Design an enzyme around this catalytic site. Sequence first.
Site, PDB file in Angstrom:
ATOM      1  N   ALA A   5       0.788  -1.225   0.000  1.00 37.85           N
ATOM      2  CA  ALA A   5       0.000   0.000   0.000  1.00 37.85           C
ATOM      3  C   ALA A   5       0.830   1.290   0.000  1.00 37.85           C
ATOM      4  O   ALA A   5       0.297   2.375  -0.264  1.00 37.85           O
ATOM      5  CB  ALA A   5      -0.949  -0.011   1.202  1.00 37.85           C
ATOM      6  N   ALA A   6       2.122   1.193   0.294  1.00 36.62           N
ATOM      7  CA  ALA A   6       2.973   2.382   0.239  1.00 36.62           C
ATOM      8  C   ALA A   6       3.788   2.458  -1.056  1.00 36.62           C
ATOM      9  O   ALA A   6       4.657   3.305  -1.184  1.00 36.62           O
ATOM     10  CB  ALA A   6       3.906   2.424   1.444  1.00 36.62           C
TER      11      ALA A   6
ATOM     12  N   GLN B 112       4.118   2.408  -5.547  1.00 34.31           N
ATOM     13  CA  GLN B 112       3.611   3.309  -6.575  1.00 34.31           C
ATOM     14  C   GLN B 112       2.176   2.976  -7.019  1.00 34.31           C
ATOM     15  O   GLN B 112       1.344   3.875  -7.134  1.00 34.31           O
ATOM     16  CB  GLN B 112       4.574   3.334  -7.755  1.00 34.31           C
ATOM     17  CG  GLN B 112       5.791   4.210  -7.490  1.00 34.31           C
ATOM     18  CD  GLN B 112       5.408   5.654  -7.135  1.00 34.31           C
ATOM     19  OE1 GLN B 112       5.260   6.004  -5.960  1.00 34.31           O
ATOM     20  NE2 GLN B 112       5.244   6.495  -8.157  1.00 34.31           N
ATOM     21  N   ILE B 113       1.865   1.695  -7.206  1.00 39.23           N
ATOM     22  CA  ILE B 113       0.499   1.311  -7.561  1.00 39.23           C
ATOM     23  C   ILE B 113      -0.482   1.687  -6.447  1.00 39.23           C
ATOM     24  O   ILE B 113      -1.538   2.274  -6.706  1.00 39.23           O
ATOM     25  CB  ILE B 113       0.398  -0.204  -7.876  1.00 39.23           C
ATOM     26  CG1 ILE B 113       1.160  -0.529  -9.157  1.00 39.23           C
ATOM     27  CG2 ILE B 113      -1.050  -0.623  -8.047  1.00 39.23           C
ATOM     28  CD1 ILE B 113       1.062  -1.988  -9.577  1.00 39.23           C
TER      29      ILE B 113
ATOM     30  N   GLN C  33      -0.462 -15.173   2.694  1.00 42.17           N
ATOM     31  CA  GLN C  33      -1.607 -14.293   2.485  1.00 42.17           C
ATOM     32  C   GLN C  33      -2.852 -15.098   2.132  1.00 42.17           C
ATOM     33  O   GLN C  33      -3.967 -14.748   2.526  1.00 42.17           O
ATOM     34  CB  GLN C  33      -1.292 -13.245   1.414  1.00 42.17           C
ATOM     35  CG  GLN C  33      -0.655 -12.003   2.029  1.00 42.17           C
ATOM     36  CD  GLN C  33      -0.114 -11.040   0.998  1.00 42.17           C
ATOM     37  OE1 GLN C  33      -0.514 -11.070  -0.162  1.00 42.17           O
ATOM     38  NE2 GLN C  33       0.804 -10.183   1.420  1.00 42.17           N
TER      39      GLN C  33
ATOM     40  N   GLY D  75       0.179  -7.962  -8.234  1.00 40.98           N
ATOM     41  CA  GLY D  75       1.614  -8.195  -8.283  1.00 40.98           C
ATOM     42  C   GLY D  75       1.990  -9.389  -9.148  1.00 40.98           C
ATOM     43  O   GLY D  75       1.350 -10.442  -9.090  1.00 40.98           O
ATOM     44  N   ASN D  76       3.040  -9.231  -9.946  1.00 41.77           N
ATOM     45  CA  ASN D  76       3.461 -10.263 -10.885  1.00 41.77           C
ATOM     46  C   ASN D  76       4.290 -11.374 -10.238  1.00 41.77           C
ATOM     47  O   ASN D  76       4.964 -11.139  -9.242  1.00 41.77           O
ATOM     48  CB  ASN D  76       4.250  -9.624 -12.029  1.00 41.77           C
ATOM     49  CG  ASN D  76       3.402  -8.685 -12.860  1.00 41.77           C
ATOM     50  OD1 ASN D  76       2.243  -8.982 -13.159  1.00 41.77           O
ATOM     51  ND2 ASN D  76       3.973  -7.549 -13.242  1.00 41.77           N
TER      52      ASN D  76
ATOM     53  N   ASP E 110      -3.962  -4.916 -19.869  1.00 45.21           N
ATOM     54  CA  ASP E 110      -3.739  -5.309 -21.258  1.00 45.21           C
ATOM     55  C   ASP E 110      -5.011  -5.074 -22.055  1.00 45.21           C
ATOM     56  O   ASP E 110      -4.972  -4.521 -23.163  1.00 45.21           O
ATOM     57  CB  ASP E 110      -3.308  -6.771 -21.351  1.00 45.21           C
ATOM     58  CG  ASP E 110      -2.004  -7.028 -20.645  1.00 45.21           C
ATOM     59  OD1 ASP E 110      -1.016  -6.320 -20.944  1.00 45.21           O
ATOM     60  OD2 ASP E 110      -1.978  -7.924 -19.773  1.00 45.21           O
TER      61      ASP E 110
ATOM     62  N   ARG F 123      -5.268  -1.437 -22.621  1.00 48.89           N
ATOM     63  CA  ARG F 123      -4.245  -1.084 -23.588  1.00 48.89           C
ATOM     64  C   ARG F 123      -4.640  -1.509 -24.996  1.00 48.89           C
ATOM     65  O   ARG F 123      -4.407  -0.779 -25.964  1.00 48.89           O
ATOM     66  CB  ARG F 123      -2.914  -1.727 -23.219  1.00 48.89           C
ATOM     67  CG  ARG F 123      -2.203  -1.052 -22.082  1.00 48.89           C
ATOM     68  CD  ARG F 123      -1.011  -1.884 -21.662  1.00 48.89           C
ATOM     69  NE  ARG F 123      -0.205  -1.202 -20.657  1.00 48.89           N
ATOM     70  CZ  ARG F 123       0.763  -1.781 -19.958  1.00 48.89           C
ATOM     71  NH1 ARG F 123       1.041  -3.066 -20.139  1.00 48.89           N
ATOM     72  NH2 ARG F 123       1.443  -1.078 -19.064  1.00 48.89           N
TER      73      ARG F 123
ATOM     74  N   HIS G 224      -0.796 -12.433 -17.865  1.00 55.91           N
ATOM     75  CA  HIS G 224      -0.133 -11.155 -18.013  1.00 55.91           C
ATOM     76  C   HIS G 224       1.345 -11.402 -18.298  1.00 55.91           C
ATOM     77  O   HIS G 224       2.168 -11.412 -17.382  1.00 55.91           O
ATOM     78  CB  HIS G 224      -0.324 -10.318 -16.743  1.00 55.91           C
ATOM     79  CG  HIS G 224       0.149  -8.906 -16.873  1.00 55.91           C
ATOM     80  ND1 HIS G 224      -0.445  -8.000 -17.722  1.00 55.91           N
ATOM     81  CD2 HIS G 224       1.170  -8.249 -16.274  1.00 55.91           C
ATOM     82  CE1 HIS G 224       0.188  -6.841 -17.641  1.00 55.91           C
ATOM     83  NE2 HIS G 224       1.172  -6.966 -16.768  1.00 55.91           N
TER      84      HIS G 224
END
Lengths: 318, 317
Positions: free
Chosen positions: A12-13, A15-16, A104, A122-123, A151, A154, A179
């Site tokens: 949560a901190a 960039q996303i 998680q 997250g990838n 995607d 895009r 992805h």
Amino acid sequence: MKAPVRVAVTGAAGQIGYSLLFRIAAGEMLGKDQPVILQLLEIPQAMKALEGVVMELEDCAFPLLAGLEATDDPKVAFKDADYALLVGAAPRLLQVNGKIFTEQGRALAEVAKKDVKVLVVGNPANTNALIAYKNAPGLNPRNFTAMTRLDHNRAKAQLAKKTGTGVDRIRRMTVWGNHSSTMFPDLFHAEVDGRPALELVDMEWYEKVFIPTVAQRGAAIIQARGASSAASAANAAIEHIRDWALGTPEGDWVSMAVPSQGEYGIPEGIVYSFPVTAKDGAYRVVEGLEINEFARKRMEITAQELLDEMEQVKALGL
Amino acid sequence: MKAPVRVAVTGAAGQIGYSLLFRIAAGEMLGKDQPVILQLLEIPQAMKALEGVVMELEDCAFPLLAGLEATDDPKVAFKDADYALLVGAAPLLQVNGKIFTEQGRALAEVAKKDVKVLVVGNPANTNALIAYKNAPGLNPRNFTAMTRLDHNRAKAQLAKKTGTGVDRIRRMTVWGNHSSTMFPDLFHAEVDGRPALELVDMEWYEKVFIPTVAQRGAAIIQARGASSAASAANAAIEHIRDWALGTPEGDWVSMAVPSQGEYGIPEGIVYSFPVTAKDGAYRVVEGLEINEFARKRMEITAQELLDEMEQVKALGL
């Protein structure tokens, strides 16, 4: 008017998260009539920065932000969550991502609401969502999804640009698979202002310009900005959740990576991007499509990649 | 689906821009029924980054984004602009002089006659001053600077202290500018329809609230290692939104606007007042009883802005 819902958000901190949280608190994700309680999770190292984000959220004076907490303990972040956005992942090992989404996964099954909606961002998103639902005993596997909405968006953007049509008139876009570089943007079913897309563009542009452009788009933005596409990723996550929860428009569908139940001959179990409609909080894979040889070959190549990743995850007992 | 409006935004590839553009393009600023054309300005060295931002905006597939261009030419960015968000400033008074002299002139030359202008780049009040002075033909009344962030910060602190929702706090005012000597006004603010000082006391107001609000930006920099881009952007959006779509009845907001001499504020300087807005026009709330405790604190920024206005004149800006 509605009672608040709880939204968990990891990484949560980062960039996303910085692009994501403010629009969620503004009501852009679940509607103006839906108060949200944000439950934010970070690694201990990022908790100081996360408290700074909390101050900023407070500083917007959002009228729908009905609660706000920040923690480094997943069992607190996920506590009675209705929504779980798993944005944080391994800093760039299948080892590390494995430990995150196992931990998680079990945490979600431990303390979240039974019908919690989970989105992995997250990838590698598809495989991370696999690890997560696989380790979430008591939770419906179908509540676990991964994001191909970026995607999707895009692809739609490149089509609008090419055909001189506003994006709002592009419908039935589809991105199949995961992805990754093998993702398959599908123009055989896509419509441009009610016309088939391939009435307005031909196969050579599709194969040689459109598909590579979408697939390479992230790398291009990294080239231009010196940073990844946080804001468009976050907007994609927001829309992924919003359509899932509030519904897809009549006549349209979106891309969502979901646990495969075998549809279109995609191997069961793996998390795979399908064309889907959503209603009342539930998605349905769009049935009755015809799949030609060009589409089929590319859909199988993504499937194989995902199958390869699954058998590698199982090789470590995750 | 009204005809689109043109929105110009400077420093478009900066931290505040990156939080701003996407919420604007989504319709958060002007409404879901209002298409927008974003006209983005940057300095030449930032144009490459800005193209990246352009790609990202496109990749959001925003249905209301009716147009999008990127340029390092103010006369291009501001052409037929209905709104202008002046975010980019000096990374000093000389540097800002050049920037806001030029941008005021560009706006006069090519923007809509009734273009609404918001200066975010610091020091906003003086930059807005320089910009309206160099904008022959545009109404000075449409040149404004942002104090909405402090206003919002102040609301947040009053809500936390009284344990109520932010939506039950009305008539907050931050007088002056975005600086450490700003004056957050609790004498007129209300909590659940009650005067704020019936719910918190003067000692807390004085010794805790006011410095807490003034020191907030620094506290966020200390925590994140970066400034308040996202909440700044939010304040800018609401500044424009309330201006454009109106303020709630019984309520008002803070905006730094050219003073006409009221409330002991020197005429001509841009200064944050409590304002209402209706039909895209704002109006300073009049007839408020000001006490000597407040007047004294207001005058600190009033006089420091007047000094800046004189200093700008001496430099022929």
